[model samples]
Target: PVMVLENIEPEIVYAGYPDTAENLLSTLNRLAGKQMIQVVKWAKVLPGFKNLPLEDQITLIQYSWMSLSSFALSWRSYKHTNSQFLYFAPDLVFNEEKMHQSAMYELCQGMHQISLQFVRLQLTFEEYTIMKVLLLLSTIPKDGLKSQAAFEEMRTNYIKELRKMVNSGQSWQRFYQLTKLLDSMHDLVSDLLEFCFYTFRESHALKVEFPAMLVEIISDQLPKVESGNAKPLYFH
Candidate 1:
């Protein structure tokens, strides 16, 4: 399941500035704990999902959990206006369009593609079959004139078809197709974020502050990559 942050409410919970790293860390820890619990509770309540094969269940849990955890970490990275943070670029304003046209867009695309490939490689034959049936079932026409009974009938038929597909070993291609669908969905979200990053910059009144805070956060969290000599004019 893709973690959508659009529903999250923004709160100015940090009313005061912390003067020490320890205090910041403490705040981050509390927020991370609260967010993790929320994620876990939501995951447990995911509807329409039945008991998956143990391996599939594990895969789902791992992927969903890591994505949400990463989001939480990234959010924390941007939450504080600390000068030392790597993400805090006092000089560089947030420009979503520029980011979309930059290397970061390519990086995100590569990551999303890789994730889809990983999922494709991991799904079992039964799971693939079930996915295909669901896709086909989802395509059924739901006319406005249709009564609740009609909708329920269509749903029941869809589920039965899906069960049949799962029981039988047909529709392997559907798994790959579904993977493509999911990838497209991810791309849509990524593109939207990229658009927002650029288009809303003016409205948001972004500034190019020294992003020492962001840099420090990234340096601490991510492994060191090879330093490149391609410094932009803006950085200089």
Candidate 2:
């Protein structure tokens, strides 16, 4: 593994905070917040990302951050640990015990399964990158984007870009499988948000602290999600 992404080097965040249940989840949320900022910056530079309406761009990032971050975490784990552990950060790797200690074992295990699939498929970084853009475009508000046509066009371009990258006569099959995997992600992310919202709602009791960015995004997203206004696109 190259230990980096195009124009972006992996950042070192300290996940070595105390391992109390509160500390563990809080540290994880804090890291998530940090990564959320990174994701926002990355999106600004993503091809055609800035071309979308400002509101659409903001909405896309807010809705997709969890899935994108989770996908990146899975890729990191797949490369660094052969999918054996959840690699949230260099200092915050989670083994099974830590998963249990963090009180997010089920979620950890669910994400682990995705990484395991990465290992099983021997997914390439190019494929991962294209799939990432696809993931970002994979969901929208049920009401739709301000530039819905533009969004669909950008997403279609990437879908074809992914198709172009697959070598072999079985490219269609491969694309089908990858799309299915993408669909699976929305399912997992739904569960992830369920946990996140519960934790967010009970932060005082849970002793977990969400950063300002997370608070802003999650608060904006909570009502839309609970009211079923958020729409996730699926290949199947």
Candidate 3:
């Protein structure tokens, strides 16, 4: 049976400087938690997605979650602040002077520029939805996948579905837009990694920071756990 297009729809600004260092930790922790939940939510979107090996699943999230969300944030920021702010969420407004003027500040400004480009592109929900699935299923290492057959099957399925959903080879203009968007992900993901490293790598390495979640991601302290199986995946 051919799968029908049964598409269903649906569904913060920093208060102030942390009173104590712990508050900063809490803030970072909250953001990390949000990203984790996001990974879980997307995983749930596909049937039987959880049966994948733990490490491979995490690898997929590590590669695409931020990249997808970053582009998502930009795409959805049209009516907000003239699209100047990154618009991650209603509460989180990462503008200059909101935080210390440092490298992260400049990074936010760079993202702001990227986000607006997509807003101008006016990507549709169908396109964005297909794009997200591609990101969720991507495994960066490109070999040595450790997940089960169902997980592998799901990834293959999404690949075909994406091509069909976008009608890639049919319309010349649509093909160009989709291809270029995927191509741009290289820099989108590069920015994600750069921000994580600059913000948390040292603190994570020193083991002195308890609250910084980006450090956990950036430090590469658990090389074995991260690379347990690995897999081939992603990009334009």
Candidate 4:
């Protein structure tokens, strides 16, 4: 048997900052900003992504960016740290002390909790990719997309893709487990958004700095989130 692993994902750096609670959060804000840009770029080339109306494309990314980011972060942490720490980037990992020092321990722990589920399942890369595709299609504006039919078609296609991977005697059971895990991500990400908005608002007082991209998306998203205009579709 020849089993070897090579680094496939690109490296995301922290860009460095002073060691303080504020800087820690600021640095992560910066990293998430960078990660969010990558998400948009990834979406642009994703099969069936560009087919959606441009407005719908922006709305979906705006609504679900946090969920996707946290999911990927959890996957990275699970892969590299065995679910022990919050792995934001190669240089910006959060250990126990750093989590506490960041003044966002519960948020960090919540992220780590999802990583533990990855450890529990010993999740496969194929499974993770399908799940991530689902997460992007999981949230939307309550009013609906400009082309709901096209969007739903894409979403259904990915669900079928996921089912194809669970080709087992207990396929339904495994599918159920994956869906339940997806539902849990919505729960966890809602809390993260709350923390994010709070920190974004208190940036001056908290010493947290958000990059321009985060500012644009979060500002556009905050009202929609607070007013219940953003809707998260749950399998449960």
The numbered model that scores best in TM-score is: 2
Candidate 3 lDDT tens digits, 63-174: 5655655655665564466577755556656566543432355556656766665667665666666666666665455454575566667767765666565543555556
As for lDDT, the candidate ahead, 1 or 3, is: 3
Per-residue lDDT for 54-77 in model 2, tens only?
899999999998999999999989
lDDT of 4 at 180: 90
Candidate No. with top lDDT = 2
lDDT of 1: 0.34
Count of clashing residue pairs in every prediction: 29, 0, 8, 0
For residues 180-201, could you state the per-residue lDDT of candidate 4 as single tens digits? 9999999989988998898888
Better of 2 and 4 by TM-score: 2
lDDT of 3: 0.54
Which residue ranges in model 1 land beyond 4 Å of their true spot?
1-17, 48-50, 53-66, 72-236
Q: Which stretches of model 2 miss by more than 4 angstroms?
A: 1-5, 8-18
- State the RMSD for candidate 3: 5.2
Clashes of 4: 0
C-alpha lDDT of all candidate models, in order:
0.34, 0.85, 0.54, 0.83
Residue 87 error, candidate 2, Å:
0.7
Candidate 2's displacement at residue 124, Å, is: 0.5
lDDT tens digits, residues 84-173, model 1? 122212222223343353324453444334334434444443433333223322311222212435434544654454444431234545
Considering only N, C-alpha and C atoms within 3 Å, which residue pairs clash in candidate 3?
A: 12-91, 12-92, 13-91, 13-92, 142-231, 142-232, 143-231, 143-232
